[PDB]
Enzyme design. Structure first.
Site, mmCIF file in Angstrom:
data_model
loop_
_atom_site.group_PDB
_atom_site.id
_atom_site.type_symbol
_atom_site.label_atom_id
_atom_site.label_comp_id
_atom_site.label_asym_id
_atom_site.label_seq_id
_atom_site.Cartn_x
_atom_site.Cartn_y
_atom_site.Cartn_z
ATOM 1 N N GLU A 40 30.344 -47.971 65.549
ATOM 2 C CA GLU A 40 30.187 -47.778 64.116
ATOM 3 C C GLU A 40 31.271 -46.823 63.644
ATOM 4 O O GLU A 40 31.658 -45.910 64.384
ATOM 5 C CB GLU A 40 28.786 -47.249 63.777
ATOM 6 C CG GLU A 40 28.540 -45.795 64.119
ATOM 7 C CD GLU A 40 28.641 -44.904 62.905
ATOM 8 O OE1 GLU A 40 28.922 -45.435 61.810
ATOM 9 O OE2 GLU A 40 28.435 -43.680 63.042
ATOM 10 N N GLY A 53 30.428 -43.157 72.235
ATOM 11 C CA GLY A 53 29.300 -42.693 71.458
ATOM 12 C C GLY A 53 29.663 -41.562 70.512
ATOM 13 O O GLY A 53 30.755 -40.992 70.547
ATOM 14 N N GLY A 86 25.963 -45.074 74.006
ATOM 15 C CA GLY A 86 26.264 -44.217 75.141
ATOM 16 C C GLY A 86 25.729 -44.768 76.449
ATOM 17 O O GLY A 86 26.357 -44.615 77.500
ATOM 18 N N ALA A 129 28.330 -38.559 70.391
ATOM 19 C CA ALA A 129 28.464 -37.293 71.107
ATOM 20 C C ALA A 129 29.843 -37.157 71.739
ATOM 21 O O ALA A 129 30.455 -36.083 71.686
ATOM 22 C CB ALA A 129 27.374 -37.175 72.171
ATOM 23 N N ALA A 162 24.495 -49.723 68.108
ATOM 24 C CA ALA A 162 23.503 -50.332 68.985
ATOM 25 C C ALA A 162 22.072 -50.015 68.580
ATOM 26 O O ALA A 162 21.142 -50.520 69.221
ATOM 27 C CB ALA A 162 23.738 -49.887 70.431
ATOM 28 N N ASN A 188 29.597 -27.964 71.132
ATOM 29 C CA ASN A 188 30.743 -28.716 71.630
ATOM 30 C C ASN A 188 31.854 -27.798 72.126
ATOM 31 O O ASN A 188 32.526 -28.118 73.112
ATOM 32 C CB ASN A 188 31.268 -29.654 70.542
ATOM 33 C CG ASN A 188 30.265 -30.724 70.166
ATOM 34 O OD1 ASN A 188 29.198 -30.831 70.771
ATOM 35 N ND2 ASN A 188 30.600 -31.525 69.161
ATOM 36 N N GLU A 240 39.677 -32.858 95.627
ATOM 37 C CA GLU A 240 39.066 -31.716 96.298
ATOM 38 C C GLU A 240 37.655 -31.467 95.782
ATOM 39 O O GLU A 240 36.753 -31.129 96.559
ATOM 40 C CB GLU A 240 39.936 -30.472 96.121
ATOM 41 C CG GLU A 240 41.373 -30.654 96.581
ATOM 42 C CD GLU A 240 42.136 -29.347 96.640
ATOM 43 O OE1 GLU A 240 41.791 -28.495 97.486
ATOM 44 O OE2 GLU A 240 43.082 -29.171 95.843
ATOM 45 N N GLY A 282 21.494 -42.335 73.424
ATOM 46 C CA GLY A 282 22.103 -43.264 72.492
ATOM 47 C C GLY A 282 22.213 -44.665 73.064
ATOM 48 O O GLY A 282 22.326 -44.869 74.273
ATOM 49 N N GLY A 283 22.178 -45.651 72.166
ATOM 50 C CA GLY A 283 22.328 -47.031 72.596
ATOM 51 C C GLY A 283 23.730 -47.336 73.088
ATOM 52 O O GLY A 283 23.913 -47.932 74.152
HETATM 53 N N1 LIG Z 1 25.557 -31.708 72.315
HETATM 54 C C1 LIG Z 1 25.750 -32.690 71.441
HETATM 55 N N2 LIG Z 1 25.009 -33.852 71.535
HETATM 56 C C2 LIG Z 1 25.201 -34.857 70.647
HETATM 57 C C3 LIG Z 1 26.144 -34.723 69.638
HETATM 58 N N3 LIG Z 1 26.132 -35.854 68.902
HETATM 59 C C4 LIG Z 1 25.213 -36.697 69.421
HETATM 60 N N4 LIG Z 1 24.619 -36.093 70.497
HETATM 61 C C5 LIG Z 1 23.569 -36.684 71.347
HETATM 62 O O1 LIG Z 1 23.439 -38.063 71.049
HETATM 63 C C6 LIG Z 1 22.080 -38.432 70.944
HETATM 64 C C7 LIG Z 1 21.903 -39.552 69.923
HETATM 65 O O2 LIG Z 1 22.687 -40.685 70.243
HETATM 66 P P1 LIG Z 1 24.082 -40.957 69.482
HETATM 67 O O3 LIG Z 1 24.708 -39.651 69.063
HETATM 68 O O4 LIG Z 1 23.847 -41.826 68.272
HETATM 69 O O5 LIG Z 1 25.046 -41.696 70.544
HETATM 70 P P2 LIG Z 1 25.277 -43.295 70.595
HETATM 71 O O6 LIG Z 1 25.477 -43.779 72.010
HETATM 72 O O7 LIG Z 1 26.490 -43.622 69.757
HETATM 73 O O8 LIG Z 1 23.985 -43.992 69.932
HETATM 74 P P3 LIG Z 1 24.127 -45.056 68.731
HETATM 75 O O9 LIG Z 1 24.526 -44.336 67.465
HETATM 76 O O10 LIG Z 1 22.806 -45.759 68.527
HETATM 77 O O11 LIG Z 1 25.183 -46.078 69.073
HETATM 78 C C8 LIG Z 1 21.344 -37.165 70.543
HETATM 79 O O12 LIG Z 1 20.083 -37.098 71.166
HETATM 80 C C9 LIG Z 1 22.230 -36.037 71.027
HETATM 81 O O13 LIG Z 1 21.676 -35.459 72.184
HETATM 82 C C10 LIG Z 1 26.891 -33.559 69.538
HETATM 83 O O14 LIG Z 1 27.728 -33.434 68.646
HETATM 84 N N5 LIG Z 1 26.690 -32.542 70.444
HETATM 85 N N1 LIG Z 2 47.014 -16.134 102.477
HETATM 86 C C1 LIG Z 2 47.133 -17.274 101.757
HETATM 87 N N2 LIG Z 2 46.219 -18.257 101.945
HETATM 88 C C2 LIG Z 2 46.294 -19.415 101.251
HETATM 89 C C3 LIG Z 2 47.385 -19.595 100.284
HETATM 90 N N3 LIG Z 2 47.222 -20.815 99.744
HETATM 91 C C4 LIG Z 2 46.123 -21.371 100.317
HETATM 92 N N4 LIG Z 2 45.569 -20.531 101.211
HETATM 93 C C5 LIG Z 2 44.366 -20.786 102.039
HETATM 94 O O1 LIG Z 2 44.481 -22.039 102.715
HETATM 95 C C6 LIG Z 2 43.190 -22.637 102.842
HETATM 96 C C7 LIG Z 2 43.287 -24.127 102.556
HETATM 97 O O2 LIG Z 2 44.191 -24.319 101.472
HETATM 98 P P1 LIG Z 2 44.552 -25.809 100.993
HETATM 99 O O3 LIG Z 2 44.941 -25.822 99.535
HETATM 100 O O4 LIG Z 2 43.395 -26.747 101.234
HETATM 101 O O5 LIG Z 2 45.836 -26.134 101.905
HETATM 102 P P2 LIG Z 2 46.321 -27.641 102.179
HETATM 103 O O6 LIG Z 2 45.268 -28.633 101.752
HETATM 104 O O7 LIG Z 2 46.616 -27.816 103.651
HETATM 105 O O8 LIG Z 2 47.587 -27.883 101.396
HETATM 106 C C8 LIG Z 2 42.279 -21.956 101.837
HETATM 107 O O9 LIG Z 2 41.179 -21.369 102.534
HETATM 108 C C9 LIG Z 2 43.114 -20.875 101.184
HETATM 109 O O10 LIG Z 2 42.413 -19.628 101.184
HETATM 110 C C10 LIG Z 2 48.345 -18.475 100.136
HETATM 111 O O11 LIG Z 2 49.301 -18.545 99.335
HETATM 112 N N5 LIG Z 2 48.154 -17.383 100.885
HETATM 113 MG MG LIG Z 3 26.777 -44.989 68.291
#
Ligand SMILES: Nc1nc2c(ncn2[C@@H]2O[C@H](COP(=O)(O)OP(=O)(O)OP(=O)(O)O)[C@@H](O)[C@H]2O)c(=O)[nH]1
Ligand SMILES: Nc1nc2c(ncn2[C@@H]2O[C@H](COP(=O)(O)OP(=O)(O)O)[C@@H](O)[C@H]2O)c(=O)[nH]1
Ligand SMILES: [Mg+2]
Ligand SMILES: Nc1nc2c(ncn2[C@@H]2O[C@H](COP(=O)(O)OP(=O)(O)OP(=O)(O)O)[C@@H](O)[C@H]2O)c(=O)[nH]1
Ligand SMILES: Nc1nc2c(ncn2[C@@H]2O[C@H](COP(=O)(O)OP(=O)(O)O)[C@@H](O)[C@H]2O)c(=O)[nH]1
Ligand SMILES: [Mg+2]
Lengths: 430, 427, 427, 430
Positions: free
Chosen positions: D62, D10, D137, D12, D90, D219, D245, D134-135
């Site tokens: 498009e 789309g 999207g 967006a 669309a 954006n 995770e 959007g269509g």
């Molecule tokens: N935040 C943000 N929203 C966007 C942006 N561009 C489009 N949108 C969202 O897109 C909606 C309109 O649909 P489209 O942008 O045309 O998306 P689409 O799926 O391609 O729809 P079609 O053009 O009919 O194919 C708007 O209501 C916006 O909320 C953007 O640049 N920033």
């Molecule tokens: N003290 C200490 N704690 C750690 C470190 N790295 C991870 N932990 C702790 O270990 C816990 C689980 O870590 P995790 O990434 O899930 O370990 P793993 O999944 O077993 O590899 C978390 O609560 C962290 O706070 C470290 O370098 N020092």
């Molecule tokens: Mg479109």
């Protein structure tokens, strides 16, 4: 280390906030940009490199006062999040600032205040500023405190507000906002200091030699009081006083927590050149009704527990001699069930002068906070002014339309009556 | 080998503690870095009483510092002798002092108590022997008055045998430094009376008064005030540290001076004292020392003994001097002022002699006494307590912590009986 | 000549082992290129325990690396001591780590197991003797917990007599690193209890706590955490590697500490540990080592012994020291704290002495103990497993690898009985 | 060494893919021509000499979006076969994009993806992007996923799809395509991530300071999340996290699999002056509802499983302290039957900035992925929207005319109701 957080509400809060933070930065060593050309942790936070940021929040429902800070010199120091500005002010209406417009922004403000609290590991209290006559100050201020009471509980919420003047008044609806705010202040605040503009106007003309002051001069005097209060919390001293110590001493009863404030010496830059200003002289000056920064005479009532704070050259031996002389004054009255009545603290950091300031480079100075029954004089005047306007229902329509239920008017009237009873009941003797 | 563990609590205790260790370290000759560079072999005989050794040729004091805020502690770190203390012995909280006895005892006391006790256990069970514990705290504050009494109870529970000698500063009646002083002092007295073997009372009023009268100090700071206290504990333990013609340690002192378990509060004084410029004109002999010792102006406790009567008294002498001269003065001072001693206990003055004087004095003396004048001190606080207690409102700050109102009545009741107990024995 | 084969499994096992070989090589003085350049002839006496010889006087460790994916050992190949390892000992799969006990045991385990076993058989039958096997693995993970237990059973089947001592990291009791840890841990518990002679439990929370309390490390990394663990296994095998006044090898440890075949889970700790700033002030001696060893804070597993009772304990000492001082301390700590020891077993504490301490430290001690406090550790995972096992759906991931429902019930029932077995022996 | 394949369907997906590889070339340091001025083989393939090539396939019915890359600067990087463009889109019609026009090109693309897998010895997962409305999207995305499920079986199919916004809508037929694609995704996808534009817009204005963003800015925020997710496989780290995770821990049930995503810090340049950006602060920011890129309040539901991914300066000590602080906030809900709920992953490679970028050069950053029943709020809104169309048969004629049988409309409705039952049954407690 141990931190204090400052919240400022309304035009009065922001402009007082300017005066306070110039003095703090222009005391500690921090440039307006945050760099340096200690106690920093109490008032400032560190961001790395060499930049500091205040622990303050500025709030008003209109942008004029805040945008002065954003365009001012000190704009770079503050964090843009800290400056919160509303869209349209409360127009000096309590209900508008409480129910309709206040609730539009209340939850935005508390997030930033709570966000600042996370960085403050050793937070010990808050400082909050109000204007009683204002709509945002009284309306939004009551809403802010009620939330902070449940948000944090057992943390000291100290306040420093501007009470309405006895005769000088810039708002007609001033009695209405003050009384409704009074009910909210009394039940939630730990302690709140009173000052009024009319006394400061007379003091800034007599003691300081100024023909025609502005709000800038009055705010500068206010800044000195707050700095001396926190001076025990920032630099070394032979007698440290913490925020929690002020809470126990100055509050005899749960609802009699309002103190009154005074500062000495208050002398022009010229006339200190003739006077030694020893400990006895500055201590004697405080107790005169002329110096005190609330336009109520203590001689009308009695004194309660008091606090004295000394800065700079003071030696503890002379404090006991000076305070003992104070007790010999038969012009000063105490209740027999409060025989001690004094807490003293000393700090070595001298007062700091202000750029284009109004004060002299005094080597030693003293700050004073006292609870007195003379404040019941102020409450009676506000109570009488309120009844005349309510008897003929002078302004009820504006407040009703903005969400307030009229039953609040008698409730706030009744709660004020009890406080007036409490001050008379405590003033009784056995 | 009679090691003494030193504990400091509160803003008052720490600032006193800093000046105290300057005196002891200077006497033994320890460099502020913790190394010995002294001038006599006798110093190294029994330095173990107060100090522990580090393997890097370092000597470390047996000190534990307690406070609820770091502000007082950080001042000590910046002090001249800051490096001497062991880094781990600093135990501090993160909350305001509160100046509230209930808050210090219940809320912040329990959390700190468990951490402090094991730190004490480190030094307590590290040395070959341990005679007693030495405590410095204030009774007008909230931290030392509250948490100090709580730790005092726990020290008794774990080590019943050891001497729990404490030094306390009693709130000055003329100019009080705290509005809520009567509440904190009265509650602490109940804990202190039943638990502590020895308590010495010190008033800042006399310290100001003695400095102004004798030393002629125009601007006496807390450094001078805390210094005048310094030799009192230095002189007392000096019998343990140095040889003499007649040794008298704490357990000798407690047995002689305490006639009954509850009458043990003591007044203390030091001699000689002289202005820093008038010392030239004063010949210094043993009789001159005795004149200052019994003079009512030299007592650091503001309770005039003449208004009461003496029960027991003890005098310590430091320096090479005649034993007859010391003994004759005790006989003479006892017979000259028989109006101030009880008939039913003869020889109310105890004596002791130590060989080595302190630094800066060729002969020196220390006085410790017990008298009914303490009724003046307890009358002041109790009368103020009744004034305050009817106005129940200050209990609000104590009720919120969890304290029951009956505790105030219990505290007054026990302290009232202590006043009565001294009244009856005057007969 | 008591060679020990070292096996490393998983993310946690490989990185701990990498730090392990840094410590041992430095202790023996083996240059990273694999040749001796050390300082003492004593290092060459019994280097055969861990090292196998290569041509040109080059020494290669008896290490085997096990993982399910290449990313882990690529970091090992870039390590400082990566050149030391034998190139062919790197055995790995080419599938996702999974973090699934069923996937690691069945799907990728069977293919890995056959290749790994013959690699083990290379080192196992290459030397004159083989006393035991050493395993490092994680239990909260999928690769080490799953494949490690599978390889553990096969090692027992071929070599029943040899000591199958393993080091394991326990899923943390309060804040951990995987949602499905109770599944992976409980399934491994059934395999670990019956097959392994000795199991040491390690917690990261204690590692974080010890670093913050004692070492004052502001940012303790896995390098520091793996360093502290590496002392424990280095100290245990030091008795084989160096002479001493009382030799105590693995088989001596197992007989003394294990009273019954299933109660063999051990808590370990190391002394001395001190902050860099405070290391000057300490008075390092034999009694100071004893205070740290039995201190609950130093123990490397978060199961407070004071909440349980002791069955057996053992301490190792390194350095030229007094035999009486070690023998006196072990008696004093036994009589002082009798409330935590079983009545029906006297002499609950074992001691041993070694001559050569590690570099930089004149003295060092290692403590290994067994206590009923492990019931806390198993209660945590048990309650969490039941809360998971009501919500069946996570089994659906394990179902894709052939894991049946009865396996979860069998794993909990045996582990629950293990809790019960420790409960009854407390009486 | 270890490979992952990206597929973009789309408009967006094509534009996001342009941003994604734009980031990866800067991250690894590869010039747009494929030369260099490590983790290359995970995302790229070498062709001898000094030329690399991405492992990506771009598909749309498009040529306008595809020809932009063909005529663009990055044209020499991509392989011409990888860029597949249809003849006529669309027209936002699911039936056209699935049955009539979708089947014209489905097998041409499937040869291309399978051909890329030949060079991927360590292929252990695919990345597929959609726009639900959007269509192409929805219609072509369903047909592609149905084939890829049987072509490869037990290989992780991870999807990053843009969910329809609660109120922001650009297509009238938007509810129709979403529900029809919903049946296809739930059975065939190993795990599909939800994001929406409306929440992306709000964060792009508040946190990142942009007055008026475009699709290009949105954006780039998407590309940062994918880069952090793939950083564990690509670069060294104390806590490596593999695709399997993520699959085992994040999804407690087969159909409940749908997670939600978050990223922090998201800050501009000048706002980063004032914040120290500690580990505690950034972890705290990840949990406020304002930072979700799915516009559903987590407080409406509960948390089942979470995964945290840290990059750069982070130390494992502060992660445990930060996570423990999060656990205390019981304004955040976990079900009792899942007490642990967290896996953290730590990587040393800091985020990569882009020229003309929108993010500040932060030294450390964190990404968040979690599953919650707060998504059930989003499904209810779509269900109520669909019923209004189908009650009066608002757009049935277009879909039936393009080959679709009407019976698929109630069946897709029934599957949605069954999935909504699953989340509520899961939300039950014992
Ligand atoms: N935040 C943000 N929203 C966007 C942006 N561009 C489009 N949108 C969202 O897109 C909606 C309109 O649909 P489209 O942008 O045309 O998306 P689409 O799926 O391609 O729809 P079609 O053009 O009919 O194919 C708007 O209501 C916006 O909320 C953007 O640049 N920033
Ligand atoms: N003290 C200490 N704690 C750690 C470190 N790295 C991870 N932990 C702790 O270990 C816990 C689980 O870590 P995790 O990434 O899930 O370990 P793993 O999944 O077993 O590899 C978390 O609560 C962290 O706070 C470290 O370098 N020092
Ligand atoms: Mg479109
Ligand atoms: N001392 C002092 N008082 C001030 C200052 N600024 C305002 N005030 C007081 O504030 C009163 C007017 O209310 P505001 O300043 O507008 O306070 P507010 O709560 O923001 O009221 P709103 O503007 O309606 O929202 C005046 O009567 C002053 O007494 C100041 O700079 N210094
Ligand atoms: N002599 C002397 N007295 C002190 C010193 N510091 C404080 N004090 C007195 O101790 C009393 C109570 O002290 P406080 O700060 O409340 O002690 P804490 O609250 O228990 O820590 C006050 O009246 C002070 O005058 C000192 O350094 N020297
Ligand atoms: Mg306003």
């Amino acid at each position: 280390m141990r931190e204090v957080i400052s919240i400022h509400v309304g035009q009065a809060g922001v402009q007082i906030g300017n005066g306070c933070w110039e003095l703090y930065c222009l005391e500690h060593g921090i440039q307006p940009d945050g760099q340096l050309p200690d106690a920093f942790n109490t008032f400032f936070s560190e961001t790395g490199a060499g930049k500091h940021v205040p622990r303050a929040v500025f709030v008003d429902l209109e942008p004029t006062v805040v945008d002065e800070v954003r365009t001012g010199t000190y704009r770079q120091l503050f964090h843009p999040e800290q400056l919160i500005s509303g869209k349209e002010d409360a127009a000096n209406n309590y209900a508008r600032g409480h129910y309709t417009v206040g609730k539009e922004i209340i939850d935005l403000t508390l997030d930033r205040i709570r966000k600042l609290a996370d960085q403050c590991t050793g937070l010990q209290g808050f400082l909050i500023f109000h204007s009683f006559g204002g709509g945002t100050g009284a309306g939004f201020g009551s809403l802010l405190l009620e939330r902070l009471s449940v948000d944090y509980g057992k943390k000291s919420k100290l306040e420093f507000t501007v009470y309405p003047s006895p005769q000088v008044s810039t708002a007609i609806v001033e009695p209405y906002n003050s009384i409704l705010a009074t009910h909210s202040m009394i039940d939630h605040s730990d302690c709140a200091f009173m000052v009024d503009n009319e006394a400061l106007y007379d003091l800034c003309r007599r003691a300081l030699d100024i023909e025609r002051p502005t709000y800038t001069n009055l705010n500068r005097l206010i800044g000195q009081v707050v700095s001396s209060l926190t001076a025990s919390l920032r630099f070394d001293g032979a007698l440290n006083v913490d925020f929690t110590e002020f809470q126990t001493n100055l509050v005899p009863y749960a609802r009699i927590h309002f103190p009154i404030c005074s500062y000495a010496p208050v002398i022009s830059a010229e006339k200190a050149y003739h006077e030694q200003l020893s400990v006895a002289e500055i201590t004697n000056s405080l107790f005169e009704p002329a110096n005190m920064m609330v336009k109520c005479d203590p001689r009308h009532g009695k004194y309660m527990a008091c606090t004295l704070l000394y800065r700079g050259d003071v030696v503890p031996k002379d404090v006991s001699a000076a305070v003992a002389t104070i007790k010999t004054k038969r012009t000063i009255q105490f209740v027999d069930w409060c025989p001690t009545g004094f807490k003293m603290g000393i700090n070595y950091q001298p007062p700091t002068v202000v750029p284009g300031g109004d004060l002299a480079k005094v080597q030693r100075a003293v700050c004073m906070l006292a609870n007195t029954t003379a404040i019941a004089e102020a409450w009676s005047r506000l109570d009488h002014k309120f009844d005349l306007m309510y008897a003929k229902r002078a302004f009820v329509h504006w407040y009703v339309g903005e969400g307030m239920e009229e039953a609040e008017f008698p409730e706030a009237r009744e709660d004020l009556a009890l406080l007036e009873k409490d001050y008379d009941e405590v003033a009784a003797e056995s | 080998v009679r090691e003494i563990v030193h504990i400091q609590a509160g803003q008052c205790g720490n600032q006193i503690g800093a000046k105290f260790w300057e005196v002891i370290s200077d006497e033994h000759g320890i460099d502020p870095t913790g190394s010995y560079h002294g001038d006599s072999d006798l110093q190294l005989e029994r330095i173990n009483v107060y100090y522990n050794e580090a393997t890097g040729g370092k000597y470390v004091p047996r000190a534990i510092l307690v406070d609820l805020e770091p502000g007082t502690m950080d001042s000590v770190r910046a002090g001249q002798f800051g490096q001497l203390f062991r880094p781990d012995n600093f135990v501090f909280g993160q909350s305001g002092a509160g100046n509230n006895w209930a808050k210090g005892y219940y809320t912040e006391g329990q959390e700190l108590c468990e951490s402090i006790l094991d730190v004490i256990r480190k030094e307590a069970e590290s040395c070959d022997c341990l005679q007693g514990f030495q405590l410095v705290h204030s009774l007008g504050g909230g931290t030392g008055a509250g948490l100090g009494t709580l730790l005092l109870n726990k020290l008794r529970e774990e080590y019943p045998d050891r001497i729990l000698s404490t030094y306390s500063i009693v709130p000055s009646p003329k100019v009080s430094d705290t509005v809520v002083e009567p509440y904190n002092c009265t509650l602490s007295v109940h804990q202190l009376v039943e638990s502590a073997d020895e308590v010495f009372c010190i008033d800042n009023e006399a310290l100001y008064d003695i400095c102004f009268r004798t030393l002629k100090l125009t601007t006496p700071t807390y450094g001078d005030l805390n210094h005048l206290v310094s030799m009192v504990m230095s002189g007392t333990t000096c019998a343990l540290r140095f040889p003499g013609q007649l040794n008298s340690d704490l357990r000798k002192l407690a047995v002689n001076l305490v006639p009954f378990p509850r009458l043990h509060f003591f007044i203390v004084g030091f001699a000689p004292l002289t202005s820093r410029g008038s010392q030239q004109y004063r010949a210094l002999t043993v009789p001159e020392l005795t004149s200052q010792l019994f003079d009512n102006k030299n007592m650091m406790a503001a309770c005039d003994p003449r208004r009461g009567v003496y029960l027991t008294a003890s005098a310590h002498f430091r320096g090479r001097m005649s034993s007859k001269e010391v003994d004759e003065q005790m006989l003479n001072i006892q017979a000259r002022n028989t109006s101030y001693f009880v008939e039913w206990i003869p020889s109310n003055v105890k004596s002791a002699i130590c060989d080595i004087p302190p630094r800066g004095l060729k002969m020196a003396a220390t006085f410790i006494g017990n008298t009914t004048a303490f009724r003046e001190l307890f009358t002041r606080v109790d009368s103020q307590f009744q004034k305050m207690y009817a106005r129940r409102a200050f209990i609000h700050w104590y009720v919120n912590e969890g304290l029951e109102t009956v505790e105030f009545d219990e505290a007054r009741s026990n302290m009232t009986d202590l006043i009565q107990e001294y009244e009856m024995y005057e007969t």
